Amino acid sequence: SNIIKQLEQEQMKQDVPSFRPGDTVEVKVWVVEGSKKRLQAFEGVVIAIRNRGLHSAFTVRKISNGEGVERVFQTHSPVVDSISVKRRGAVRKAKLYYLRERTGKAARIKERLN
Amino acid sequence: MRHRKSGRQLNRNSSHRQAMFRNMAGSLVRHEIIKTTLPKAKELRRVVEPLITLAKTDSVANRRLAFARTRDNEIVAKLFNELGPRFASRAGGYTRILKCGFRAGDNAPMAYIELVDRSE
Amino acid sequence: AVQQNKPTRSKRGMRRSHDALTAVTSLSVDKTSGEKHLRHHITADGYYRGRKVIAK
Amino acid sequence: MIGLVGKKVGMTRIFTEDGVSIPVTVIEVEANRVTQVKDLANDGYRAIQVTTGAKKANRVTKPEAGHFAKAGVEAGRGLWEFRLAEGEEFTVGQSISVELFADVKKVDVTGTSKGKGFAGTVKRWNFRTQDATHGNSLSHRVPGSIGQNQTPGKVFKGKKMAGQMGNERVTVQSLDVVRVDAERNLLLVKGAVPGATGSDLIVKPAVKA
Amino acid sequence: MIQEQTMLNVADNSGARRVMCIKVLGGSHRRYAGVGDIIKITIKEAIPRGKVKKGDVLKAVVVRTKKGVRRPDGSVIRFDGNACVLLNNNSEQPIGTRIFGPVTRELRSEKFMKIISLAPEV
RNA sequence: AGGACCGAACCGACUAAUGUCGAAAAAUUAGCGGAUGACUUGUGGCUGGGGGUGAAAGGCCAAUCAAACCGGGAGAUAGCU
RNA sequence: ACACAGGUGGUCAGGUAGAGAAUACCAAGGCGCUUGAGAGAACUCGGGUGAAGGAACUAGGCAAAAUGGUGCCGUAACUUC
RNA sequence: AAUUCCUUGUCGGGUAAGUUCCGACCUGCACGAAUGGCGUAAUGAUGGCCAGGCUGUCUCCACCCGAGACUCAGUGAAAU
RNA sequence: CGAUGUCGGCUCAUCACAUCCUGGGGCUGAAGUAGGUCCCAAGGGUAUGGCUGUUCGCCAUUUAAAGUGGUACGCGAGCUGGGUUUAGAACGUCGUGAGACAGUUCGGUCCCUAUCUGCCGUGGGCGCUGGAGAACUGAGGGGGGCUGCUCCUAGUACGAGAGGACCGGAGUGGACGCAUCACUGGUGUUCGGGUUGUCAUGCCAAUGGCACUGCCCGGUAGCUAAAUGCGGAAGAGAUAAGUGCUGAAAGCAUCUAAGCACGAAACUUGCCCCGAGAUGAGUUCUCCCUGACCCUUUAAGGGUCCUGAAGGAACGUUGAAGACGACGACGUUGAUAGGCCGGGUGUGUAAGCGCAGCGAUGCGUUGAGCUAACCGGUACUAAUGAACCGUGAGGCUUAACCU
Numbered sequence A: 001s002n003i004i005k006q007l008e009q010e011q012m013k014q015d016v017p018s019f020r021p022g023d024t025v026e027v028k029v030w031v032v033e034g035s036k037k038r039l040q041a042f043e044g045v046v047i048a049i050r051n052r053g054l055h056s057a058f059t060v061r062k063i064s065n066g067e068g069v070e071r072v073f074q075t076h077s078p079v080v081d082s083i084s085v086k087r088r089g090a091v092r093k094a095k096l097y098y099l100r101e102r103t104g105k106a107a108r109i110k111e112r113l114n
Numbered sequence B: 001m002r003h004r005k006s007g008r009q010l011n012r013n014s015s016h017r018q019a020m021f022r023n024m025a026g027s028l029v030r031h032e033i034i035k036t037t038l039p040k041a042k043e044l045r046r047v048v049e050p051l052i053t054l055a056k057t058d059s060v061a062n063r064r065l066a067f068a069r070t071r072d073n074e075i076v077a078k079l080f081n082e083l084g085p086r087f088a089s090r091a092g093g094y095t096r097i098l099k100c101g102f103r104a105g106d107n108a109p110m111a112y113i114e115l116v117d118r119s120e
Numbered sequence C: 001a002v003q004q005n006k007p008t009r010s011k012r013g014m015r016r017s018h019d020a021l022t023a024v025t026s027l028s029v030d031k032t033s034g035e036k037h038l039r040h041h042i043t044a045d046g047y048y049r050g051r052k053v054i055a056k
Numbered sequence D: 001m002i003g004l005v006g007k008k009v010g011m012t013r014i015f016t017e018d019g020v021s022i023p024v025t026v027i028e029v030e031a032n033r034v035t036q037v038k039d040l041a042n043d044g045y046r047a048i049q050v051t052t053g054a055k056k057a058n059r060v061t062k063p064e065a066g067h068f069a070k071a072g073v074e075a076g077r078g079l080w081e082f083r084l085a086e087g088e089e090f091t092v093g094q095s096i097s098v099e100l101f102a103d104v105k106k107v108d109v110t111g112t113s114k115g116k117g118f119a120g121t122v123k124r125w126n127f128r129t130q131d132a133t134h135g136n137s138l139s140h141r142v143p144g145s146i147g148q149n150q151t152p153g154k155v156f157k158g159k160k161m162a163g164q165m166g167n168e169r170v171t172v173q174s175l176d177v178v179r180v181d182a183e184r185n186l187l188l189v190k191g192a193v194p195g196a197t198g199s200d201l202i203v204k205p206a207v208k209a
Numbered sequence E: 001m002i003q004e005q006t007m008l009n010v011a012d013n014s015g016a017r018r019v020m021c022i023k024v025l026g027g028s029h030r031r032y033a034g035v036g037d038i039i040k041i042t043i044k045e046a047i048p049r050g051k052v053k054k055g056d057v058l059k060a061v062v063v064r065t066k067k068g069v070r071r072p073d074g075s076v077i078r079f080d081g082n083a084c085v086l087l088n089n090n091s092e093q094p095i096g097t098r099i100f101g102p103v104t105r106e107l108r109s110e111k112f113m114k115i116i117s118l119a120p121e122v
Numbered sequence F: 001a002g003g004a005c006c007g008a009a010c011c012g013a014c015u016a017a018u019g020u021c022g023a024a025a026a027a028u029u030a031g032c033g034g035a036u037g038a039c040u041u042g043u044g045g046c047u048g049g050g051g052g053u054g055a056a057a058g059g060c061c062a063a064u065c066a067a068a069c070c071g072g073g074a075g076a077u078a079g080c081u
Numbered sequence G: 001a002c003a004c005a006g007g008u009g010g011u012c013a014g015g016u017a018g019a020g021a022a023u024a025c026c027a028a029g030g031c032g033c034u035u036g037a038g039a040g041a042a043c044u045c046g047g048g049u050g051a052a053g054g055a056a057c058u059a060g061g062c063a064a065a066a067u068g069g070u071g072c073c074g075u076a077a078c079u080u081c
Numbered sequence H: 001a002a003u004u005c006c007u008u009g010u011c012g013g014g015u016a017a018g019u020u021c022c023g024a025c026c027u028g029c030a031c032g033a034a035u036g037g038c039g040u041a042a043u044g045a046u047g048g049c050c051a052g053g054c055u056g057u058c059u060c061c062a063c064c065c066g067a068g069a070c071u072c073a074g075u076g077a078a079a080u
Numbered sequence I: 001c002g003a004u005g006u007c008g009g010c011u012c013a014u015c016a017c018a019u020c021c022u023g024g025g026g027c028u029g030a031a032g033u034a035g036g037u038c039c040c041a042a043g044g045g046u047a048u049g050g051c052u053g054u055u056c057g058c059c060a061u062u063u064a065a066a067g068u069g070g071u072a073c074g075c076g077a078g079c080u081g082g083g084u085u086u087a088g089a090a091c092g093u094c095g096u097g098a099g100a101c102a103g104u105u106c107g108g109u110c111c112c113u114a115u116c117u118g119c120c121g122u123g124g125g126c127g128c129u130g131g132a133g134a135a136c137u138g139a140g141g142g143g144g145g146c147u148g149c150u151c152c153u154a155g156u157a158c159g160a161g162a163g164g165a166c167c168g169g170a171g172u173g174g175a176c177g178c179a180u181c182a183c184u185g186g187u188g189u190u191c192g193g194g195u196u197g198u199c200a201u202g203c204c205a206a207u208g209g210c211a212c213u214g215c216c217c218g219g220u221a222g223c224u225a226a227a228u229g230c231g232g233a234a235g236a237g238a239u240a241a242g243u244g245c246u247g248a249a250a251g252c253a254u255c256u257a258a259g260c261a262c263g264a265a266a267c268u269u270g271c272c273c274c275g276a277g278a279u280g281a282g283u284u285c286u287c288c289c290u291g292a293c294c295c296u297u298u299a300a301g302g303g304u305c306c307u308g309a310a311g312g313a314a315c316g317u318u319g320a321a322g323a324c325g326a327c328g329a330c331g332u333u334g335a336u337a338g339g340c341c342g343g344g345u346g347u348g349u350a351a352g353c354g355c356a357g358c359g360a361u362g363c364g365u366u367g368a369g370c371u372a373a374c375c376g377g378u379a380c381u382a383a384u385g386a387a388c389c390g391u392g393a394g395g396c397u398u399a400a401c402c403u
């Protein structure tokens, strides 16, 4: 409907970087510890992008110290502070779900340099 | 439960539906009027009218895209030459369904469907 | 699964009270030709709303 | 107090400043206009009868067209009724808008829910499905036993069986009002209300407070 | 989403390497355990020099799930595997000293602050 | 070489589901066993009813088997219904 | 007993892939199985896919899923070698 | 124990929990030496038991694709 | 005994109360916490596993609690067939034997298309006294009702100490129910892509068929849970067990005889849903019809002609409504469906051409091409002028009212 689109475009953040799946992206989110409120980085490869306007999302796969972490981020949420593309990746797919069962030298993807 | 679902299953599987709608789209192009069942005629507008809209732009990509459908070079030649420019000003709605009685064999409601020129 | 007494002719008469057919009551006339037909159906000659659509 | 009649137009979410996303339902509540005010002397009870929206002139029949012409209001679609809660009085022809909910904090949204058609007992009443194998002959989603034996000799009234599910008047109680926007004729309530998108809602303040 | 018979990895250095949930604690007919819930486990596989041995019935708090926890803005944090940290079967304050891998902010719950301190991330 | 191995035809019939007023008075579907042998198959023979035949189940002997079928004694007999 | 999903000995037997008369797609040849038309409920049958868990099911892993080819490397207890 | 009634004997193993299984004990209701006793490689659509893999078997079902069911036309049964 | 189906499990139950939990009290050898016992109370709630065919039981681990019974030891025209009750075989034992077990053990066909009652749903007919369109009133009925934990009160009351509250308040779960698709996901054989074998489109290139959607990788809409909203109440009336006030019979005493006040998840309401076939058929608002004649056994009579309202139905386009009916939207004075246009979304850089390379293949054109059910539009196509049904002031009696 038209009333939904008018109510959602009042709420979208208007400065978002244009990244693709396969890109390596550092995301800074707002972490609250009591009254203290800092920023914590979460840098990994982007494996899927849900492109839905205000309901847009993207999940980032980060192989941390011994464990693989997979975190989705609502893009226009005020929790996500900064999105920055560290490295552009060259994959010819939209969803990179095959990366969940690959480690090390098989889970790396080639630079785009387009 | 079928909420907002489109497309008639028509008591076939999906390969039969794609095959027979490929057949009666080419015969609707060839003779410019056919007699069929009324539920089968309403589902033919969702097949043959994108084939006429594909004929508005004569290109090698469109003629191969309209050859991946209909699988018949005589249909690709009557489109893009005799149906593309002939319907080039019509903004959709290239067919017309006219109900014609009931079939004698099984009491099936029948319909004529034709391209809207048929000037003889 | 099966009946225990047989139903009477009175009972199958009451079940068949909805088996009764209904008529059409909606024969039209053509604009030019004058033939009787159904609503939204072409005539036997091939007219619909005063236009020989079928040419056959 | 009295309620208002709106129209469910989709769902969306509101992002608050402290991170929290709240799922809202956008109810479009136009200006309800009173068509009949009922009194104790003429009706045995006091209530108001409002209408909302608009209806085409060739579809408004002559009996109901005279009912709108007596109030002198525009012929909207549908007619609803709200009992006056002993401390409010309304005049015929008054236009009530969504800014009545500007101080209400919880509402009860009554709608007609989605219709599931003929539903089995697994969907309708959350019956446990029998086992898929280990012998089972033609009895997977069947209800099983429906009564006891010769001593009851019957099925009890109100036995949970298959049948029509949904397409039914459902009220969801105590929904938080997120935002009342009188200029866009909007009402955002936190959560899900009954019905599909485009259906009539009856929004009234929550009696459970 | 941990139920009975679920095999979990072990996130501290207590000695166990693979444990199996035998009960989800707190409330009747409770089917699942999230990422801050306490389960009863048995130890199916341990290291030789550990503080716990195979076949031992004690408690554990779930710290990681493949299903994951949902933050209050829609966001979900999923892991590659279910992990837990072994408790003391009649008290809190876990047996192990080091804690491996990340944890979640939901574990910051006034009695697992020992686990928040010893964890390398989150 | 082999009552060897895997595996079609062919011969069997272990499990499951369907069917069970069946499509069928025992099958179908999906798997299953043997598959150069104490194998299997065509044609023609031989064994006949207290008899045959039986790697033996009281199995089989024309959809019938703790004594076949047909005709006769015969309207057996029935303190039973 | 049927215009019956069964039974019936022998002969001929191509192309591409394949070890192959397996299997898949085709040739020669032969067919669409003698009620159709719609709709897209429960439920039943035959299937497909499934979050997290992974036999907790159950009399019993019944059923389903899985394994699967060729070359090479490698292979324990036990043994009548 | 294909044998044991008391009995789920006792003890050990495996399990968080084991009337089953395995190992042992001997008080063998009522084992036993060609109506064979005790072993045994290989074998088995054989009986029990455990483990890995695997999974809608299940927690707990959801959705989809077809065939019926439902409606229309033609034909047209059955048990009782 | 011319058939009434055996154990347990599954699925689904329903009732009782001799009450397991929650609730209200009396007594205690009741300090508090926690109990014991008795009384009242059936509103709701009342485990998962290991072993075994088992009910049971033992054990492990839970839980506020893991209640006891009745209902053909509920439930096989609902399922199973492990147990025992057929035919095979063997062991122990008994018997000379055929065979048989206070016995073990391995194997072993579970049919029914629902006429009636009942029940879940959903229609048709008629009635409700002129017809019709709406909105209601509510008799009556149904659903729902469970509870933990932490904190505050307060380490206060209590106690030598260890311990540790009542009464109130806040927060948060488990189980269960309803709704929903905004998010997280499943599905998505109608969307896009990759790839194997083979056949075909004359061939290359490009595509199509078939092989379970050939095998797969994603994925729109819808549907849906694991997803996330909400609910269980407070209050009120009458009480149970119980505690009382005043008070005699019986100068006192005494909760009771007169009178009076409290008192529980039970009862009646409050909350949600159905509901005037509630034949006691209700109420309100609005709309429509105010023509002639004849005939007879003159009656709430029959017949002809003219008329044909409001409204309904039928038909068509349909729907987040649906088995069919029904229900909702629309029918040209029209966005109802299809198409079309723009967008979105999904998939990941189409074909053709050019370039680089021996070639496979890469690069450029190019986030390209295609894109279902989605959104916003747009009369291009199909929703027809009609006809059909339903009428022509609506009984009697009595009262009160204008005449």
Ligand SMILES: COC(=O)c1c(OC)cc2cc3c(c(O)c2c1C)C(=O)[C@]1(OC)C(=O)C=C(OC)[C@@H](O)[C@]1(O)C3=O
Residues within 6 Å of the ligand: I085, I086, I087
């Ligand atoms: C106690 O358990 C029974 O009540 C029972 C049973 O429980 C499932 C099944 C059956 C099955 C059957 C029979 C039964 O008696 C029987 C019995 C008694 C027969 O008598 C049978 O005819 C039907 C026949 O005459 C000869 C045969 O073998 C010689 C059988 O195979 C037979 O064919 C059959 O199927």
Ligand SMILES: [Mg+2]
Residues within 6 Å of the ligand: I087
């Ligand atoms: Mg037999």
